Structure 1
Amino acid sequence: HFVRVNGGHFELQGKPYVITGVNMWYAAYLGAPNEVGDRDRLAKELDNLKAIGVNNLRVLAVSEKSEINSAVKPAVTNGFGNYDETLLQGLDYLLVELAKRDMTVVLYFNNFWQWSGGMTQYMAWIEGEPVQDPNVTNEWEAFMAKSASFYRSEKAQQEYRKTLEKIITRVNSINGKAYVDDATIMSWQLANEPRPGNSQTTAEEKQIYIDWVHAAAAYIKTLDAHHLVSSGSEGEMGSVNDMQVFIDAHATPDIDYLTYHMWIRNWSWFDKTKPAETWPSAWEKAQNYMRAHIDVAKQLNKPLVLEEFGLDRDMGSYAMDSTTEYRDNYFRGVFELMLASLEQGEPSAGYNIWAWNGYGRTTRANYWWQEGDDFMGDPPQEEQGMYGVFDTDTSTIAIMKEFNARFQP
């Protein structure tokens, strides 16, 4: 019983399936059997998530070893081809745990950004030069150009396909299931937020990006003809603000469904220090972004998942006891509009909040993750508490539970 696509919606055993999800990048890490893992916590997190109506996690499948202090440590890939089999047993365990609970997972295999190593880490290994952490340089245009250089590197593509092959052809070491046979996996996903480059991307670079999405999705389908494939794109914003790049990249049959993300604070629509003043304008831009991507989903006749979206705590606090009124009202507005869209038969096929902190805790004064600290939905490139929902965020969890039930057929 795999998750399938039929037009603008997902089906499971021929019944509509709607994604009522969270991002939990570290869920497979939690499954590791060694000191990196926390299997007791993983079971408790999944129990709590299931109790609040979550059916789907979006999870990082692979990381690349990094020496920067904005990235997960340890890594799955300790230089090209040097995979940590003990950490892969954590993915095996996560898949067993999700199956017990009738939850699914979307697994992404790379990262535009630095927090799992990702595309810039590929390039650093190839060139024998260290990664420039954009949290240190504040040189984001240069970072995005460097990350997109990955698509043009034949060596990087060979290693990336090596990595896709290593996971897709895996046998679950616990239950013996081939990954290609495991219905717990909803989708393979090319990367987290792949973009074509920076704001100065050329027409040739846009075409390289489009061709990369097509060829990578085709390659996965050679290994696995039946799991869904998605890109992990943010949408228009992840397409150098060119909706035609989004359309062209995702028009291939091998992309089964569409993704979009929304980052109203990172995109400068919302100012976390002036929330009352900036929310009205930010909400106008968000509702327009949602309609623009629902309209593209109708044109391509594919489901659309808002698989990553979040908002700061009130006044940008990282503290657990800070209020989340702006986040909660944003989530309400998104869920109201998306539920209306689903009622009207449009390809709105659900969501994954960014992100789930659950029982994870920091005791770092500066909220900055260090190796050995609890993993949170906020990865190591962001303060622990920036975007994640803690178990104690009662107001937010009530909204999630309410709408998770309303979105279920």
Structure 2
Amino acid sequence: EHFVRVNGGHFELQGKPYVITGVNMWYAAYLGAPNEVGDRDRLAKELDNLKAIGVNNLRVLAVSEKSEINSAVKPAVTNGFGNYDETLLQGLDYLLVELAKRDMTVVLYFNNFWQWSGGMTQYMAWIEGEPVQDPNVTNEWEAFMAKSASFYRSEKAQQEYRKTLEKIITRVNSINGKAYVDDATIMSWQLANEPRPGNSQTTAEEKQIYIDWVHAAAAYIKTLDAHHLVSSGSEGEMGSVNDMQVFIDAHATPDIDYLTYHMWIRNWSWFDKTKPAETWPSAWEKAQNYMRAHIDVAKQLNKPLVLEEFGLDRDMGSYAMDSTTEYRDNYFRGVFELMLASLEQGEPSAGYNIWAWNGYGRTTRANYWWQEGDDFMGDPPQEEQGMYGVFDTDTSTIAIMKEFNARFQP
């Protein structure tokens, strides 16, 4: 029908500006599955609530790789190379039908730097014949990130990645009969969740391999689909081994239509969730700098910029649904205020996706750890259920979302 397009530093839909006022709901396609893995009744109710809060865009995982670790989604879409669960992919079909009824769009990412959907390290585990070592268990994060980036250098891994891209992009929706390439419900194809060049000791050669991978992968998708937007899923500078020139060079290709950045002030040690009053002022100074730096790059490259992930812990780091969210709420207000001013001033700030949406999902696990069969939440299986997710009962947070979702609309 009519697709979301780019014109300079903004998106357009039917010749009018389009601003992303979104959430991350990684599990939305799983929820559409027609078997016991799905919860279609819940999916419709969630999308009805989100639409009522002014949400126009979801960012969703397209594919997962089978993993045996206890920090990963189960079951998976890809049960060994080429062995796709068609019943689960009907969940993506169903999601696309449901979004289209509500004039909502989706950004679909095809891989994962991290472990919670298998992702790049699971590709390498299958190739190498050695199981993934869950970094939640080993705490060997530097080793993990290096293994994950080894994906870019593997010809077999790239062949298999390209096969998966082709499998999904050329899909026909089994429900409505729409080819995916013809479906304007899809806003963008996205290379991966948070692809990084490697660990803190990444070499110049490894930076170039990453740049070349982003270029080649985006160009490959454009051979399949000349018209949908393509984005990388990068965090920005923090996902570029703290080298903004890597970010710039990777995203300078015309086959990348818009820019992404993610902001994780607690993960980056700028904010201490157990010393929030003491650390908030410094964290906010650093967050505003991170936003400004990326807005400047978006001006340089003449592309829209989406804050496609950002979030903050509940008060004192609680996972409980009855805990307060004062710090999170004030953070979201600050980010929204700055971004709205940016947009008013004609800068390439083109919207956002909060990380993440829990909605009607619930856990009764004492340790807040997801187990197979448990409600899917915006917090994926590698984090406590309740870490960053916004519940339907988080009234104060939802009111802020409702307000700004309306204000960001042209």
Shorter-chain TM range is over 0.9
Distance (Å, rounded) in 2 between the aligned partners of 1:84 and 1:34: 11
Equivalent residues in 2 for 1:110-149, closer than 5 Å: 110-149=111-150
Q: Are 2:281 and 1:302 aligned?
A: no
- Paired residue for 2:5? 4
Per-residue Cα deviation, 1:135-192 (whole angstroms, up to 9, x for no partner): 0000111110000000000000000000000000000000000000000000000000
- What is the alpha-carbon distance in structure 1 between the residues aligned to residue 65 and residue 141 of structure 2? 20
Q: Whole-Å Cα distance in 1 between the matches of residues 129 and 80 of structure 2?
A: 11
Aligned-partner Cα distance in 2 for 1:309–1:154: 33
SS, match of residue 60 in structure 2: strand
TM-score (norm 1): 1.00
- 1:235 corresponds to which residue? 236
SS of 2:387's partner is: coil
Q: CA deviation at 1:388?
A: 0.2
Q: Distance in 2 between matches of 1:363 and 1:166?
A: 37
What whole-Å deviation, never above 9, does each CA across 1:57-82 have from its counterpart, x for those lacking one? Answer: 00000000000000000000000000
Structure 2 spans left out of the alignment, 5+ residues: none
Shift of 1:321: 0.3
Q: Deviations over 1:315-363 (max 9, x none)?
A: 0000000000000000000000000000000000000000000000000
Aligned residue for 2:293, secondary structure, equals: helix
1:196 aligns with 197
Post-superposition shift, 1:221? 0.1
> Structure 1 CA distance, aligned partners of 2:295 and 2:33?
38
> Alignment partner of 1:372: what SS?
coil
Query: Cα offset for 1:11?
Result: 0.1
How far did residue 115 of structure 1 move? 0.2
Give the deviation of 1:96 after TM superposition: 0.1
Structure 1 runs, 4 residues or longer, greater than 4 Å off: none
How far 1:95 sits from its partner (Å)?
A: 0.1
> Post-superposition shift, 1:257?
0.1
CA distance in 2, matches of 1:14, 1:346: 19
Q: 1:210 Cα shift? A: 0.2
Distance in 2 separating the partners of 1:371 and 1:162: 28
Instruction: Report the alpha carbon displacement of residue 364 of structure 1 after superposing the two structures with TM.
Output: 0.2
Q: 1 CA distance for matches of 2:166 and 2:382? A: 28
Taking the aligned partners of 1:337 and 1:97, their CA distance within structure 2 comes to 32
Partner of 2:336: 335
Deviation string, structure 1 residues 193-220 (Cα, Å, up to 9, x no partner): 0000000000000000000000000000
Distance 1:396 1:71 in 2: 28
Q: How does 1:153-302 map to 2 (within 5 A)?
A: 153-302=154-303
Number of paired residues?
409
* 1-structure distance, mates of 2:396, 2:164: 40
Cα distance in 1 for partners of 2:309, 2:116 equals 16
Percent pairwise identity: 100
- How far residue 405 of structure 1 moved from its aligned partner, in angstroms, is 0.1
Q: Deviations over 1:29-64 (max 9, x none)?
A: 000000000000000000000000000000000000
> Within 2, Cα distance between the matches of 1:362 and 1:342?
38
Gap runs ≥5 in structure 1 = none
Q: In the TM superposition, what whole-angstrom CA distance separates every residue of 1:270-324 from its partner, at most 9, and x where no partner exists? A: 0000000000000000000000000000000000000001000000000000000
Q: TM-score, normalised by structure 2?
A: 1.00
Task: Quote the Cα distance in structure 2 between the aligned partners of 1:137 and 1:321.
Answer: 32
Between the aligned partners of 2:406 and 2:212, the Cα distance in structure 1 is 39
* CA distance, structure 1, for counterparts of residue 283 and residue 153 of structure 2: 35
Q: Deviations over 1:353-376 (max 9, x none)?
A: 000000000000000000000000
SS at match of 1:64: coil
Q: Distance in 2 between matches of 1:4 and 1:325?
A: 37
Q: Deviations along 1:361-399, whole A, 9 cap, x unmatched?
A: 000000000000000000000000000000000000000
SS in 1 for 2:260: strand
**TM-aligned CA deviation for residue 129 of structure 1:** 0.2
2-structure distance, mates of 1:399, 1:367 = 26
Please state whether the residue corresponding to 1:350 is helix, strand or coil.
strand
CA shift at 1:7, angstroms? 0.2
CA deviation after TM superposition for structure 1 residue 24, in Å: 0.1
Deviation (angstroms), 1:124: 0.2
2: CA distance, partners of 1:245 / 1:316: 33
**Partners of 1:141 and 1:163 in 2: how far apart?**
27
What is the alpha-carbon distance in structure 2 between the residues aligned to residue 55 and residue 222 of structure 1? 28
Query: Following TM superposition, by how much is the alpha carbon of 1:92 offset from its aligned partner in structure 2, in angstroms?
Result: 0.1
